[PDB]
């Protein structure tokens, strides 16, 4: 019902 | 948005432009088919629902959908001088029929995992430099959460960041919300690829300065308020 979003990720590990 | 890129149509299905007297003024996010979550500051000069229109589409010049507004609710303890409780709700006249390209963001759980340093997206039609002009097409920026304690460093906000706020920016500076982005979302997704609104664009000292991250309303702090005003959980 909510929250479907883009083909993007919020990865935290990239330097 | 400073240091961002133009968003693709459909990327941010919850993002709306809130237009005051037929000009983009603020961002907001659909949290269900009749309610938009935004900033109280948006309404400091005009809180007349009849003077506001919400639009969907990446362009404020040629929006895809225009939506009449029925009511505007401001947090009863909004204090503009300290920016405390900068949160508002906009009720649409008509329920939106949701599609791939227009639908709601999820509200965070009270215990939502939002760790210091975690990446997030902020979106809006705000300026690309402090106090500059709005942009016609939606932009996006990837930032990191900056803990309140770090944000409150003496060379940063020195205690002005309160518990219902959060900060975000990038290590080198230069990526941030800016004037005209107020009310728009700061979002993170979970392991099931569900996107949650963790922050609402609020304020900052200029834009994109490394020692002065952008300041957001912390959505988790207002879940009860949102539920009381709208019925929505989550
Ligand atoms: Mg993430």
Author numbering:
A (entry chain A): 172 to 186
B (entry chain B): 187 to 420
From the primary publication:
We reapplied this approach to TMPRSS11D by replacing its zymogen activation motif, LSEQR186 ↓ ILGG with DDDDK186 ↓ ILGG to create a dasTMPRSS11D construct, which greatly improved protein expression levels relative to the wild-type TMPRSS11D ectodomain protein which showed no detectable protein band (eTMPRSS11D). When the dasTMPRSS11D protein was overexpressed, purified, and concentrated to ~5 mg/mL, it underwent rapid autocleavage activation. The activated dasTMPRSS11D protein migrated on SDS-PAGE gels at a molecular weight of approximately 27 kDa and produced a single elution peak when purified further by size-exclusion chromatography. These data suggest that the dasTMPRSS11D protein underwent proteolytic cleavage to release its SEA domain, consistent with observations in HEK293 cells overexpressing full-length TMPRSS11D, where the serine protease domain was detected in conditioned media and the N-terminus containing its SEA domain remained attached to the cell surface. The dasTMPRSS11D crystallization trials were initially performed in the presence of high concentrations of nafamostat or 6-amidino-2-naphthol. Protein crystals formed in the presence of each ligand, but the final crystal structures contained no electron density matching the ligands. Instead, the zymogen activation motif of dasTMPRSS11D, DDDDK186-CO2-, was found occupying the substrate binding cleft of a nearby TMPRSS11D molecule within the crystal lattice. Interestingly, both the eTMPRSS11D S368A zymogen activation motif (yellow) and dasTMPRSS11D zymogen activation motif (magenta) adopted an α-helical structure oriented perpendicular to the face of the SP domain, whereas all other TTSP zymogen motifs were β-strand structures wrapped around the SP domain and/or the electronic density was poorly resolved around this region. The TMPRSS11D SEA domain was not resolved in either TMPRSS11D crystal structure. To facilitate the analysis of soluble forms of these TTSPs, we replaced their zymogen activation motifs with DDDDK; this delayed their zymogen activation and enabled protein overexpression, biochemical assays, and protein crystallization.
